[PDB]
Structure 1
């Protein structure tokens, strides 16, 4: 099925390669998680619809639906779904990726590779982007862009 919620993306013993969001009948994840491969959901199959390697995003069953934006000001929550661990909310004040094409909110939180695609939320529970495309800074820790698509 395609019931709303957050999902693990698994491969098969089974390995968690990522996470994604089901909203409005569309599954949203990061391109590097699935490379656009079809996804089994119960007895059904979800096919890729749209994606962009540069944004590192892919949607299944329809166009990208997530359009909430970080307000540049407020704290957010990473709904982290790490491999082998229950989903947990982590609240943080984003930093900023300053790029030649504008600023992007960015969260300084470090999780295993298979946490990629975990949603980042605003105070209303809307998904303002997905975790897992980022940089490593001098001390070894990680900063993820808040990666959001266009609806």
Structure 2
């Protein structure tokens, strides 16, 4: 169906009404989203079907119709934009300076913005409009607020 580059809502009709369970990026004919959004299930785009191609639970990422295409990285210094697509609400760009998730396997960028769980998969961008990662997998800090990692895949 629609294979135009851009940001898309991931909807489901299994529950009451049409519920938004996540968001994704269409780039170079590949749909990129978070694994916890689809659980690796097939997606519909009008009359067309999108089949999973690559997926990993630990990374929490999945790609449809082809290999993962997003490979831009956070420079570790500049502000970024979360292009938040919330359920029932219009896509909005929120500018923020990321924090740092310090891990035993290296440091990763982190965006401290609170959005409903169905906003998972919304892209995080650099000043060039390039997707540096997806929003939706992180931690809940002391006051109930969410801090998501800047999650990026590997371009093979």
Question: So what's the TM-score if we normalise by structure 1?
Answer: 0.98
Give the unaligned 5+ runs of structure 2.
none
Q: Distance in 1 between matches of 2:40 and 2:8?
A: 16
1:56 pairs with 2:60: yes
Q: Distance in 1 between matches of 2:92 and 2:136?
A: 16
Q: Distance in 1 between matches of 2:89 and 2:152?
A: 25
Q: Secondary structure in 2 aligned to 1:69?
A: coil
Cα distance, 1:2 vs structure 2: 1.1
Q: Distance in 2 between matches of 1:41 and 1:138?
A: 40
Cα distance, 1:95 vs structure 2: 0.1
Aligned pairs (5 A) from 1:58-73: 58-73=62-77
Q: Secondary structure in 1 aligned to 2:4?
A: coil
Cα distance, 1:125 vs structure 2: 0.4
Aligned residue for 2:82?
Answer: 78
Give the unaligned 5+ runs of structure 1.
none
Cα distance, 1:58 vs structure 2: 0.1
Q: How many residues align?
A: 150
Deviation by residue 1:82-139 (Cα, 9 ceiling, x = unmatched): 0000000000000000001111000000000100000000000000000000001111
Q: Distance in 2 between matches of 1:72 and 1:42?
A: 39
4+ runs deviating over 4 angstroms: none
Q: Distance in 2 between matches of 1:143 and 1:113?
A: 12
Q: Distance in 1 between matches of 2:7 and 2:153?
A: 17
Q: Distance in 2 between matches of 1:150 and 1:2?
A: 22
Across the aligned residues of Structure 1 and Structure 2, the Cα RMSD in angstroms comes to: 0.4
Question: So what's the TM-score if we normalise by structure 2?
Answer: 0.95
